[PDB]
Ligand binder design. Structure first.
Ligand SMILES: [Ca+2]
Ligand SMILES: [Ca+2]
Ligand SMILES: [Ca+2]
Ligand code: NA
Length: 172
């Protein structure tokens, strides 16, 4: 008598209120989620399914409570921010992605780890090192080798390409 094939009504209401989705959209996302992960808990191996490193970094941000599983509430809220969030919401989310040790700063090495993963997944951009050097030249204002949330927000907003990439809604 499986009890998690659909959401409880109160949870449909909760999740609709916490995201940019309609009730119908929340239920549609659950249908697909539970089909692909009947346990209701998506683990790192499942999320994975060369992209290994970057999928693992994204997995950790989806995993809000850090218990090694992405449950639906986590899945749908991450989808909400990354697909439909405002520019500032998406920037806060991206900062969490890059801040690997959750200390409130993105170091050069933290960023390098992410950018390498993206690459693993034009001469002046042909290494992760070059890409990071450029980002830090543009965003690190006190030259201490790390980005505060403010440095990352303001730095990102200065660059038209970054603004474009974070200003989409359902990919458009
Ligand atoms: Ca979790
Ligand atoms: Ca950090
Ligand atoms: Ca700095
Ligand atoms: Na600009």
């Amino acid at each position: 008598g499986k009890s998690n094939s659909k959401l409880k009504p109160e949870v449909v209401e909760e999740l609709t209120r916490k995201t940019y989705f309609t009730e119908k959209e929340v239920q549609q996302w659950y249908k697909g989620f539970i089909k692909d992960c009947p346990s209701g808990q998506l683990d790192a191996a499942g999320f994975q399914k060369d992209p290994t490193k970057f999928a693992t970094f994204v997995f950790n941000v989806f995993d809000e409570n850090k218990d090694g599983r992405i449950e639906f509430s986590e899945f749908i809220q991450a989808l909400s921010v990354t697909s439909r969030g405002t520019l500032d919401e998406k920037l806060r989310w991206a900062f969490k992605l890059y801040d690997l040790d959750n200390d409130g700063y993105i170091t050069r090495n933290e960023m390098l780890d992410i950018v390498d993963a993206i690459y693993q997944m034009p001469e002046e951009e042909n290494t992760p090192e070059k890409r990071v050097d450029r980002i830090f030249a543009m965003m690190d204002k006190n030259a201490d080798g790390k980005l505060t949330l403010q440095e990352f927000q303001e730095g990102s907003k200065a660059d038209p390409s970054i603004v474009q990439a974070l200003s989409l809604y359902d990919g458009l």
